[PDB]
Structures are given as structure tokens and as C-alpha cells.
């Protein structure tokens, strides 16, 4: 019943500099526990005991605090280090976490590399068709994708998804997906992704003919 | 070293009780507790309850009167059990060891009376010293999730596998991409290693440029 209360919800922060997040408690906690969760992973077991390092997390690594105040601290932010961190008690009946802070490692701006590709010859003897278009490796998050059909915006028909941030060059991906029925498909020639990105002076398109080996 | 392997069904009927296994290894169940914690999709961790060593248990308050946690020691095994279920007990769902520092590495039971469907795999075929892309594209399954390697796990560097997308018919569709030398397209060969566990269905792709 103790609640966690953590902040920032969200922060973003460039190499070498100092990071603080807080958890705050509704009730006094004897000891205070940090998980680190990534993409596609169970929650590691981080800091522990208020102050001390599970074996193998780097020493830039800290946890304070006492009573109801809380906090875990990177003195210098390193790319591997962004991740999703949760505090964790347990020092009544009744084990909570705090609802978690996400850390991004800010670095500098990079173009998407665009990648279009037409629906394969085997979905379309299936009878569906999708068109993919790639974003690959860009920074910040922020990006924008347009379908277009000879010339014709595609509205409603399109969904897209995003990677997490690499750990390594800190970059997000993006894949949207078109979808046409196969007569669509096939009565139209020109397909086209258009991408809006701050690493961008203009939109970029990305386009191929139908029936163009 | 300590090892926690959870059994679940992938999907399961409302009208059903959700009932997952986590079988453990290297400590005592007679001494230690184990505990289960879940995860819906996009969200926060949440504990669930747990059970003590001598066989006593713990639950969460807000959810005491739907869990069940029980287990058998000489088989090394603990049993969860979930009534009252609703859509949204779709969840990842963890069995965690002693001292919290061991977890398993979950298990995504999505909560529906819809029906399983493995998915069709299909090659998004690179484009015709240069970097290209390739990638499969998972399409029309139900319900999550799909694992993708490419060349049995040979090749890692440059991968990209999407978060599925829920279309309007109620199925999930996937991409995962890689970018190598384009140099290497007409010499290397591409397979992306595509598994549906909730359907037992996995697939093999080979990926080459169009001819």
C-alpha cells in the first residue's frame, strides 16, 4: 500500500552529464531497490539495499536516500545507459514499484537513411499487398511519414512503429506499412514514402514503379 | 546458476483461468519464496503475490480475490492461477527468485476469445560501399508475440525488429530489417528465423534480390 511516486516521468540526457531521478514514498521505507529494464528484457536487478550495485553495473552508478526520499544517480550519462528505471520497496506486506523513469541519451541530430519496398511477388499471389517504408537510424524521435499513390496522399491506410533507442549509436528505426487490396495495387504505378526529419532541409521521397524489375 | 522457466498458454479464454508454470534450479523452494509480477504491453510492473518457503502466501490487495499461488517443492515447480479474467489481464508475466535478483524471462499471455493463426512470412527483397536493407515482413497472427533472428543468430549487427502493429482485423503484423554492404548481396546468403510460439508455428525465410 505504500505508493512510489518517480520523476522525471521522462528525461533526456547527453554524454557525461549528471543524472538524478527521484522516487518518493507515501509512507516511511526502510530500504529502497532500482530495476533497469531495456527493450524486450525482464527488469534487472540494479541497485539494491538503497546504495549498493548488483555485480556488474558500472560504478557511475549511485542510489541515496532515507525515510521517504529516494534517488538514483548516473554521474555521467553513457549511451548503454538509457533504459526505462523502476524503484521498487518492500517494506510492508505488499510489494510495490514506482511507475518508472525513461532515460534517452541525447546526441546529435541524424538523418534517416529511406528504404521503399514493394509488396513481394509471393504476398501478392497470396492476395494482399503491402508496401514497407524503412527509416533507418535517425535522431530525434520526432519523424514524419507520406504515403502517396500516383500522387495521391494515402490517408488511413498506413501504421507505423519505432524502435527503441540503440544502445550503442543511440538512433531510433521506423517501419511503416501501406496496405492495398491487389487490384489497388496493381492499377497504380508510382508508390512513394515521403519522410519529414530534422536532419532533413526537405522532405525526402522514396519511390518506385510498379512492374519495374 | 539460478534459472526460472515459465510454462503459459499464450492465449486464453476469458472464460478460462489463466494457469502458468515456473519450473526453478539452483535453489531450495523450501527456503525461498517465489513471487509473480506482470507487465501489459507498454506499461509498468505490478506484483502479483508470492509464495514463502514453508507454503505460505502473500497477494496483492487489489487483486487477493482473483490469485491462487501454490506448489509442488520435490518437483521444483510453482503454480499461478488467475480467475475472473478479462482482456485486459493481457500481460508479459514473471516468476522472480530469491532476493528479486533472479527473474524469468517472461511469458506474454494475451486474454481473448479469438482464435489462433500463425502468421505468413514474406521477403522485403533489397532494392536494386553502399549500404542496402532487407527485412521480412511477419504478416496476419494472432496473438503475440513473434521472435525474428536472422541466419539462425549469425547475424546481429545492423537488425531492427519492429513493435507489431494491430491492424484492423484484429491480426498483428511485423517487420524486422538488417542493413549490410550492398557488395555482399550477390554472395552472402539472408534467412530470417521467424517463431509464433502461440500457434507452433515457425517459418524460415530466405531473403535475395529480385531476379
Known amino acids: 500500500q505504500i505508493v512510489l511516486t518517480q520523476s522525471p516521468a521522462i528525461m533526456s540526457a547527453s554524454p557525461g552529464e549528471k543524472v538524478t531521478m527521484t522516487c518518493s514514498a507515501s509512507?516511511?521505507?526502510?530500504?529502497m531497490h532500482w530495476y533497469q529494464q531495456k527493450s524486450g528484457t525482464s527488469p534487472k536487478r540494479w541497485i539494491y539495499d538503497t546504495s549498493k550495485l548488483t555485480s556488474g553495473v558500472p560504478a557511475r552508478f549511485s542510489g541515496s536516500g532515507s525515510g521517504t526520499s529516494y534517488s538514483l544517480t548516473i554521474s555521467s550519462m553513457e549511451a548503454e545507459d538509457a533504459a526505462t528505471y523502476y524503484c521498487?520497496?518492500?517494506?510492508?506486506?505488499?510489494?510495490?514499484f514506482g511507475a518508472g523513469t525513461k532515460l534517452e541519451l541525447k546526441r546529435t541530430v541524424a538523418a534517416p537513411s529511406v528504404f521503399i519496398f514493394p509488396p513481394s511477388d509471393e504476398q501478392l499471389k497470396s492476395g494482399t499487398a503491402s508496401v514497407v517504408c524503412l527509416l533507418n537510424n535517425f535522431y530525434p524521435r520526432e519523424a514524419k511519414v507520406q504515403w502517396k499513390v500516383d500522387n495521391a496522399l494515402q490517408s488511413g491506410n498506413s501504421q507505423e512503429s519505432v524502435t527503441e533507442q540503440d544502445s550503442k549509436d543511440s538512433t531510433y528505426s521506423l517501419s511503416s506499412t501501406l496496405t492495398l487490396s491487389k487490384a489497388d495495387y496493381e492499377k497504380h504505378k508510382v508508390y512513394a514514402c515521403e519522410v519529414t526529419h530534422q536532419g532533413l532541409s526537405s522532405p525526402v521521397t522514396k519511390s518506385f514503379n510498379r512492374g519495374e524489375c | 546458476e539460478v534459472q526460472l522457466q515459465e510454462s503459459g498458454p499464450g492465449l486464453v479464454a476469458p472464460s478460462q483461468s489463466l494457469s502458468i508454470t515456473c519450473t526453478v534450479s539452483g535453489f531450495s523452494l523450501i527456503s525461498y519464496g517465489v513471487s509473480w509480477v506482470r507487465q501489459p504491453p507498454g506499461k509498468g510492473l505490478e506484483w502479483l503475490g508470492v509464495?514463502?518457503?514453508?507454503?505460505?502466501?502473500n497477494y496483492h490487495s487489489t487483486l487477493i480475490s482473483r490469485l491462487s499461488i501454490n506448489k509442488d517443492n520435490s518437483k521444483s515447480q510453482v503454480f499461478l492461477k488467475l480467475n475472473s479474467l478479462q482482456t485486459d489481464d493481457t500481460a508479459t508475466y514473471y516468476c522472480?527468485?530469491?532476493?528479486?535478483?533472479?527473474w524469468g524471462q517472461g511469458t506474454l499471455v494475451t486474454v481473448s476469445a479469438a482464435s489462433t493463426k500463425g502468421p505468413s512470412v514474406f521477403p522485403l527483397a533489397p532494392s536494386s560501399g553502399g549500404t542496402a536493407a532487407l527485412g521480412c515482413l511477419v504478416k496476419d497472427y494472432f496473438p503475440e508475440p513473434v521472435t525474428v533472428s536472422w541466419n539462425s543468430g549469425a547475424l546481429t549487427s545492423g537488425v531492427h525488429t519492429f513493435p507489431a502493429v494491430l491492424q484492423s482485423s484484429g491480426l498483428y503484423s511485423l517487420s524486422s530489417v538488417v542493413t549490410v554492404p550492398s557488395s555482399s548481396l550477390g554472395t552472402q546468403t539472408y534467412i530470417c528465423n521467424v517463431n509464433h510460439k502461440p500457434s507452433n508455428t515457425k517459418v524460415d525465410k530466405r531473403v535475395e534480390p529480385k531476379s
Open positions: 509464495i514463502w518457503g514453508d507454503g505460505s502466501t
Open positions: 521498487q520497496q518492500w517494506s510492508s506486506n505488499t510489494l510495490t
Open positions: 522472480v527468485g530469491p532476493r528479486f535478483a533472479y
Open positions: 509512507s516511511s521505507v526502510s530500504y
